[PDB]
Scaffold this active site. Structure first.
Site, PDB file in Angstrom:
ATOM      1  N   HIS A   1      -1.746  -4.014  -8.245  1.00  0.00           N
ATOM      2  CA  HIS A   1      -1.605  -3.886  -7.702  1.00  0.00           C
ATOM      3  C   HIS A   1      -2.417  -4.477  -6.195  1.00  0.00           C
ATOM      4  O   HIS A   1      -3.458  -4.644  -6.283  1.00  0.00           O
ATOM      5  CB  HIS A   1      -1.040  -1.690  -7.126  1.00  0.00           C
ATOM      6  CG  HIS A   1      -2.648  -1.448  -6.495  1.00  0.00           C
ATOM      7  ND1 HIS A   1      -2.739  -0.603  -5.321  1.00  0.00           N
ATOM      8  CD2 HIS A   1      -4.038  -1.814  -6.499  1.00  0.00           C
ATOM      9  CE1 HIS A   1      -3.622  -0.741  -4.457  1.00  0.00           C
ATOM     10  NE2 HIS A   1      -4.653  -1.058  -6.356  1.00  0.00           N
TER      11      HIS A   1
ATOM     12  N   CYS B   1      -8.322  -1.981  -0.449  1.00  0.00           N
ATOM     13  CA  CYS B   1      -8.708  -0.967  -1.489  1.00  0.00           C
ATOM     14  C   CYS B   1     -10.059  -1.096  -2.254  1.00  0.00           C
ATOM     15  O   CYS B   1     -10.194  -2.823  -2.647  1.00  0.00           O
ATOM     16  CB  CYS B   1      -7.668  -0.412  -2.262  1.00  0.00           C
ATOM     17  SG  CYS B   1      -7.463   1.375  -2.736  1.00  0.00           S
TER      18      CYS B   1
ATOM     19  N   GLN C   1      -0.155   7.626  -7.499  1.00  0.00           N
ATOM     20  CA  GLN C   1       0.937   7.952  -6.803  1.00  0.00           C
ATOM     21  C   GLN C   1       1.649   7.819  -7.372  1.00  0.00           C
ATOM     22  O   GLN C   1       2.456   7.596  -8.416  1.00  0.00           O
ATOM     23  CB  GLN C   1       0.820   6.606  -5.034  1.00  0.00           C
ATOM     24  CG  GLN C   1      -0.192   7.280  -4.234  1.00  0.00           C
ATOM     25  CD  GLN C   1      -1.129   7.384  -5.157  1.00  0.00           C
ATOM     26  OE1 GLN C   1      -1.844   8.450  -4.463  1.00  0.00           O
ATOM     27  NE2 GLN C   1      -2.003   6.146  -5.070  1.00  0.00           N
TER      28      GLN C   1
ATOM     29  N   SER D   1      -2.482   4.826   2.150  1.00  0.00           N
ATOM     30  CA  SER D   1      -2.793   3.744   2.757  1.00  0.00           C
ATOM     31  C   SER D   1      -2.044   3.239   3.385  1.00  0.00           C
ATOM     32  O   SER D   1      -2.084   2.713   4.618  1.00  0.00           O
ATOM     33  CB  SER D   1      -3.894   3.208   1.939  1.00  0.00           C
ATOM     34  OG  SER D   1      -4.773   3.665   0.457  1.00  0.00           O
TER      35      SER D   1
ATOM     36  N   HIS E   1       1.956  -1.068  -0.489  1.00  0.00           N
ATOM     37  CA  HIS E   1       1.247  -1.520  -1.807  1.00  0.00           C
ATOM     38  C   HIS E   1       1.927  -3.020  -2.429  1.00  0.00           C
ATOM     39  O   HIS E   1       3.932  -2.333  -2.646  1.00  0.00           O
ATOM     40  CB  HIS E   1       0.831   0.175  -2.419  1.00  0.00           C
ATOM     41  CG  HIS E   1      -0.674   0.434  -2.246  1.00  0.00           C
ATOM     42  ND1 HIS E   1      -0.929   1.105  -2.711  1.00  0.00           N
ATOM     43  CD2 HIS E   1      -0.665   0.560  -0.824  1.00  0.00           C
ATOM     44  CE1 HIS E   1      -1.924   1.394  -2.304  1.00  0.00           C
ATOM     45  NE2 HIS E   1      -1.759   1.246  -0.892  1.00  0.00           N
TER      46      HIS E   1
END
Length: 163
Positions: A59, A113, A131, A154, A157
């Site tokens: 990701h 990230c 998630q 965040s 993604h």
């Protein structure tokens, strides 16, 4: 075996004597046990089950102005607007899907990230670890598929199932 989703002739649900336990009984052969018996007709085999308990997906995290925490090794105060956000994730989908920009090297160079360590490749995980929207989309894509813009904690993604 069969998917047993019915109760053919003879089978009838009954409760234990003076009790409250529910079971199944067939008068045709005087059978008595739990779980559904047959599946209406008799022949059944349209089941599946199994599937891998884990999956390997990569990701790309791209925080935005609405990020719960706009800060990472990539930047101190991230504020990618709606366009700027999707502009990155989307543009990344084009190059990657085109085979010009490897997701691996891609994610890493833009991985906001800590995934950078694995160039976005989170590795083999189990459904229910990451998630909710992630796992779903992840487990919902095919081998070698790339998910679109996913807005999570965040930011946006991009998922890419490996195997």
């Amino acid at each position: 075996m069969a998917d047993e989703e019915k109760l053919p002739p003879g089978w009838e649900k009954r409760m234990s004597r003076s009790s409250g336990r529910v079971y199944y009984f067939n008068h045709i052969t005087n059978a008595s046990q739990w779980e559904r018996p047959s599946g209406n007709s008799s022949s059944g085999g349209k089941n599946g089950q199994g599937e891998p308990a884990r999956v390997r997906c990569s990701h790309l995290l791209v925080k935005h102005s609405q990020s719960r925490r706009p800060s990472s090794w990539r930047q101190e105060k991230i504020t990618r607007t709606k366009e700027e956000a999707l502009e990155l994730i989307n543009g990344y989908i084009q190059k990657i899907k085109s085979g010009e920009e490897d997701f691996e090297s891609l994610a890493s160079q833009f991985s906001d990230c800590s995934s950078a360590k694995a160039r976005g490749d989170l590795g083999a995980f189990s459904r229910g670890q990451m998630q909710k929207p992630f796992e779903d989309a992840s487990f919902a894509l095919r081998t070698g598929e790339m998910s679109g813009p996913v807005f999570t904690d965040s930011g946006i993604h991009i998922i890419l199932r490996t195997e």
